[PDB]
Structure 1
Amino acid sequence: KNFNMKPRLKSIFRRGLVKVAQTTGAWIITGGSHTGVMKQVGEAVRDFSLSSSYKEGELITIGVATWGTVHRREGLIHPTGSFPAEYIL
Protein backbone atom coordinates (compact mmCIF):
# COMPACT_ATOMS: atom_id res chain seq x y z
CA LYS A 1 0.00 0.00 0.00
CA ASN A 2 3.09 2.28 -0.17
CA PHE A 3 4.41 1.64 -3.67
CA ASN A 4 4.92 3.24 -7.09
CA MET A 5 5.33 1.91 -10.64
CA LYS A 6 7.75 2.59 -13.49
CA PRO A 7 7.99 0.57 -16.72
CA ARG A 8 11.44 -0.97 -17.03
CA LEU A 9 11.62 -1.99 -13.37
CA LYS A 10 8.35 -3.86 -13.94
CA SER A 11 9.77 -5.48 -17.08
CA ILE A 12 12.94 -6.55 -15.25
CA PHE A 13 10.96 -7.96 -12.31
CA ARG A 14 8.55 -9.89 -14.54
CA ARG A 15 11.26 -11.28 -16.82
CA GLY A 16 13.34 -12.40 -13.85
CA LEU A 17 10.30 -13.99 -12.23
CA VAL A 18 9.29 -16.12 -15.20
CA LYS A 19 12.87 -17.07 -16.07
CA VAL A 20 13.61 -18.19 -12.51
CA ALA A 21 10.26 -19.92 -11.96
CA GLN A 22 9.77 -21.70 -15.29
CA THR A 23 13.09 -23.56 -15.08
CA THR A 24 13.93 -26.21 -12.47
CA GLY A 25 11.67 -26.52 -9.43
CA ALA A 26 12.06 -23.03 -7.98
CA TRP A 27 9.78 -22.13 -5.07
CA ILE A 28 8.88 -18.43 -4.87
CA ILE A 29 8.03 -17.28 -1.35
CA THR A 30 5.97 -14.11 -0.92
CA GLY A 31 3.35 -12.69 1.43
CA GLY A 32 -0.41 -12.56 1.05
CA SER A 33 -1.88 -9.36 -0.46
CA HIS A 34 -2.80 -7.83 -3.83
CA THR A 35 -0.86 -4.55 -3.58
CA GLY A 36 1.80 -3.15 -5.91
CA VAL A 37 4.71 -5.36 -6.96
CA MET A 38 3.27 -7.79 -4.43
CA LYS A 39 0.25 -8.10 -6.76
CA GLN A 40 2.45 -7.93 -9.85
CA VAL A 41 4.41 -11.08 -8.94
CA GLY A 42 1.12 -12.96 -9.07
CA GLU A 43 -0.09 -11.23 -12.22
CA ALA A 44 3.16 -12.35 -13.85
CA VAL A 45 2.45 -15.83 -12.48
CA ARG A 46 -0.84 -16.03 -14.38
CA ASP A 47 0.64 -14.19 -17.37
CA PHE A 48 2.95 -17.19 -17.67
CA SER A 49 0.38 -19.80 -16.57
CA LEU A 50 -2.36 -18.82 -19.04
CA SER A 51 -0.17 -20.16 -21.88
CA SER A 52 1.51 -23.31 -20.55
CA SER A 53 2.09 -26.71 -22.15
CA TYR A 54 1.48 -28.71 -18.97
CA LYS A 55 -1.34 -26.26 -18.14
CA GLU A 56 -3.08 -26.18 -14.73
CA GLY A 57 -0.47 -25.04 -12.17
CA GLU A 58 3.19 -25.14 -13.19
CA LEU A 59 4.17 -22.88 -10.27
CA ILE A 60 3.94 -23.21 -6.49
CA THR A 61 3.61 -19.69 -5.07
CA ILE A 62 3.19 -19.69 -1.28
CA GLY A 63 1.55 -16.74 0.46
CA VAL A 64 2.27 -15.78 4.07
CA ALA A 65 0.01 -13.43 6.04
CA THR A 66 -1.19 -12.76 9.58
CA TRP A 67 -4.68 -13.87 10.59
CA GLY A 68 -5.08 -10.54 12.37
CA THR A 69 -4.59 -8.73 9.05
CA VAL A 70 -7.39 -10.43 7.10
CA HIS A 71 -10.44 -8.51 5.89
CA ARG A 72 -13.07 -11.23 5.43
CA ARG A 73 -12.26 -13.56 8.31
CA GLU A 74 -15.98 -14.25 8.76
CA GLY A 75 -16.55 -17.53 6.93
CA LEU A 76 -12.92 -18.70 7.02
CA ILE A 77 -13.45 -20.59 10.31
CA HIS A 78 -14.84 -24.14 10.37
CA PRO A 79 -15.11 -26.60 13.29
CA THR A 80 -13.80 -29.69 11.48
CA GLY A 81 -14.17 -29.14 7.73
CA SER A 82 -16.47 -28.04 4.93
CA PHE A 83 -13.89 -26.70 2.43
CA PRO A 84 -15.67 -24.34 0.03
CA ALA A 85 -13.44 -21.66 1.60
CA GLU A 86 -15.12 -18.85 -0.33
CA TYR A 87 -13.14 -15.59 -0.25
CA ILE A 88 -14.57 -12.91 -2.53
CA LEU A 89 -12.02 -10.20 -3.39
Structure 2
Amino acid sequence: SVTGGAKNFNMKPRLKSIFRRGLVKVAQTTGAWIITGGSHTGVMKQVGEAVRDFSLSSSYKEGELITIGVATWGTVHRREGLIHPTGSF
Protein backbone atom coordinates (compact mmCIF):
# COMPACT_ATOMS: atom_id res chain seq x y z
CA SER A 1 0.00 0.00 0.00
CA VAL A 2 1.77 3.11 -1.24
CA THR A 3 0.77 6.57 0.04
CA GLY A 4 2.03 10.08 -0.69
CA GLY A 5 1.27 13.68 -1.50
CA ALA A 6 -1.63 14.25 -3.88
CA LYS A 7 -2.00 17.84 -5.08
CA ASN A 8 1.29 19.47 -4.05
CA PHE A 9 4.04 16.95 -4.72
CA ASN A 10 7.53 17.60 -6.08
CA MET A 11 10.35 15.08 -6.44
CA LYS A 12 14.04 15.01 -7.40
CA PRO A 13 14.93 12.73 -10.39
CA ARG A 14 16.73 10.17 -8.12
CA LEU A 15 13.41 9.62 -6.24
CA LYS A 16 11.69 9.21 -9.67
CA SER A 17 14.15 6.41 -10.67
CA ILE A 18 13.12 4.08 -7.76
CA PHE A 19 9.40 4.20 -8.80
CA ARG A 20 10.27 3.08 -12.39
CA ARG A 21 12.46 0.09 -11.37
CA GLY A 22 12.35 -0.63 -7.60
CA LEU A 23 8.55 -0.56 -7.06
CA VAL A 24 7.70 -2.23 -10.44
CA LYS A 25 10.47 -4.88 -10.09
CA VAL A 26 9.29 -5.89 -6.62
CA ALA A 27 5.66 -5.78 -7.67
CA GLN A 28 5.93 -7.81 -10.84
CA THR A 29 7.69 -10.94 -9.58
CA THR A 30 5.74 -11.81 -6.44
CA GLY A 31 2.34 -11.20 -8.02
CA ALA A 32 1.55 -8.29 -5.74
CA TRP A 33 -1.56 -6.18 -5.25
CA ILE A 34 -0.65 -2.53 -5.44
CA ILE A 35 -3.36 -0.76 -3.53
CA THR A 36 -3.42 3.01 -3.48
CA GLY A 37 -5.62 6.06 -3.57
CA GLY A 38 -7.43 6.54 -6.82
CA SER A 39 -6.37 9.94 -8.12
CA HIS A 40 -4.77 11.43 -11.20
CA THR A 41 -2.54 13.75 -9.18
CA GLY A 42 0.86 13.40 -7.61
CA VAL A 43 2.28 10.10 -6.47
CA MET A 44 -0.71 8.02 -7.53
CA LYS A 45 -0.17 9.35 -11.03
CA GLN A 46 3.45 8.19 -10.83
CA VAL A 47 2.39 4.68 -9.86
CA GLY A 48 -0.25 4.75 -12.58
CA GLU A 49 2.22 5.66 -15.28
CA ALA A 50 4.98 3.37 -14.08
CA VAL A 51 2.72 0.31 -14.15
CA ARG A 52 1.22 1.12 -17.57
CA ASP A 53 4.38 1.16 -19.69
CA PHE A 54 5.39 -2.21 -18.25
CA SER A 55 2.22 -3.70 -19.73
CA LEU A 56 3.01 -2.26 -23.15
CA SER A 57 6.68 -3.21 -23.03
CA SER A 58 5.87 -6.73 -21.84
CA SER A 59 5.29 -7.75 -25.51
CA TYR A 60 2.05 -9.74 -25.02
CA LYS A 61 3.24 -11.32 -21.78
CA GLU A 62 0.72 -13.13 -19.62
CA GLY A 63 -0.58 -11.44 -16.50
CA GLU A 64 -0.89 -7.82 -15.44
CA LEU A 65 0.20 -6.20 -12.20
CA ILE A 66 -3.25 -5.73 -10.71
CA THR A 67 -3.89 -2.37 -9.11
CA ILE A 68 -6.78 -1.32 -6.91
CA GLY A 69 -7.54 2.29 -6.09
CA VAL A 70 -9.70 3.67 -3.30
CA ALA A 71 -10.99 7.22 -3.25
CA THR A 72 -13.86 9.08 -1.69
CA TRP A 73 -17.14 9.33 -3.57
CA GLY A 74 -17.60 12.95 -2.55
CA THR A 75 -14.65 14.55 -4.30
CA VAL A 76 -15.23 13.17 -7.80
CA HIS A 77 -15.65 15.59 -10.69
CA ARG A 78 -18.12 14.07 -13.15
CA ARG A 79 -19.66 11.30 -11.05
CA GLU A 80 -23.18 12.31 -12.09
CA GLY A 81 -22.62 10.35 -15.29
CA LEU A 82 -21.57 7.33 -13.27
CA ILE A 83 -24.83 6.86 -11.38
CA HIS A 84 -26.94 4.51 -13.46
CA PRO A 85 -29.92 2.99 -11.63
CA THR A 86 -29.80 -0.27 -13.53
CA GLY A 87 -26.68 -2.36 -13.84
CA SER A 88 -24.27 -0.15 -15.75
CA PHE A 89 -22.47 -2.99 -17.47
Identify whether the pair has TM-score above 0.5, normalized to the shorter chain.
yes
C-alpha contact 1:49 1:56 (8 A) present in aligned 2: no
TM-score by length of 2: 0.82
Report which structure shows greater RCO (CA 8 Å, sep ≥6): 2
Query: Residue 14 of structure 1: CA displacement?
Result: 2.0
Structure 1 residues 56 and 72: CA distance shift in structure 2, 3 A: farther
Aligned CA-pair RMSD? 1.7
C-alpha contact 1:32 1:63 (8 A) present in aligned 2: yes
C-alpha contact 1:28 1:62 (8 A) present in aligned 2: yes
Aligned match of 1:17 in 6, 16, 23? 23
CA distance in 2, matches of 1:82, 1:65: 20
- Total equivalences in the alignment: 83
Structure 1 residues 56 and 71: CA distance shift in structure 2, 3 A: farther
Query: Residue 57 of structure 1: CA displacement?
Result: 5.5
SS of the aligned residue for 1:35 comes to coil
CA distance in 1, matches of 2:35, 2:18: 18
